[PDB]
Design a protein around this ligand. Structure first.
Ligand SMILES: [Zn+2]
Ligand SMILES: [Zn+2]
Lengths: 52, 56, 111
């Protein structure tokens, strides 16, 4: 591994501490009374595709 | 020798100006573990120290 | 931006009607209740950009200590402009410049 940069980068990624806060860009809370559907039109397609 | 020293100092100032433009247009490479401002400051300091050493 | 009671002036808190399955904003010192229009009850931004270009005033062209450039204004196409870097001053702030013309005062960049 010492003489190969790719494996070294793999090890470096495996060691470094990473939390959800590191990758999270924003968080939101919504009111949505239908578990099988949604109010947001943007996320409607993905949730309906998941439910089907 | 004074014209050589003046030319070296002017060249270093031109290089620092180019680095300033590159940093202001987001074209500057970032040294790992350092922010954009820190990398910019380190590069400028290194350029100026090299300028003084060359003139001396 | 959050609303307040129209007769008590106190802050209206979100509430849910069990029987109606609707979101409502209800005051706590009064029985006033108003229907909620948007479902976004709460939003928190981990990475934010506000405060970067919002720091604009109409009379920023009267400052003599500000450098004057010759960048072309997209709106007025004037030959005189004043530029400054980001007002937000976090440790990881970019060094991009914001150019303000003396007629339209539109903020733009060279990117
Ligand atoms: Zn009230
Ligand atoms: Zn103008």
């Amino acid at each position: 591994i010492a003489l190969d940069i790719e494996k070294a980068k793999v090890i470096q990624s495996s060691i470094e501490y990473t939390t959800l806060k590191n990758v999270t860009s924003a968080t939101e809370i919504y009111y949505d009374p239908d578990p099988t559907s949604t109010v947001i039109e943007e996320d409607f397609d993905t949730v309906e595709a998941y439910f089907s | 020798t004074m014209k050589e020293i003046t030319h070296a100092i002017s060249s270093a100032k031109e290089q620092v100006q180019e680095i300033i433009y590159k940093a202001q247009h987001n074209e500057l490479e970032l040294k790992p573990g350092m922010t954009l401002r820190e990398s910019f400051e380190g590069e400028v300091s290194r350029t100026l120290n090299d300028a003084r050493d060359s003139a001396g | 931006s959050f609303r307040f009671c129209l007769e008590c002036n106190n802050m209206l808190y979100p509430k849910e009607d069990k029987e109606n399955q609707r979101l409502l904003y209800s005051c706590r010192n009064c029985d006033y209740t108003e229907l909620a229009e948007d479902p976004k009850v709460y939003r928190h931004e981990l990475i934010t950009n506000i405060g970067e270009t919002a720091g604009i005033v109409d009379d920023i062209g009267q400052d003599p200590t500000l450098p004057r450039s010759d960048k072309e204004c997209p709106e007025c196409h004037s030959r005189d402009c004043v530029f400054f870097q980001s007002q937000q001053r976090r440790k990881d702030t970019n060094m991009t410049l914001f150019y303000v013309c003396l007629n339209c005062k539109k903020t733009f960049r060279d990117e």
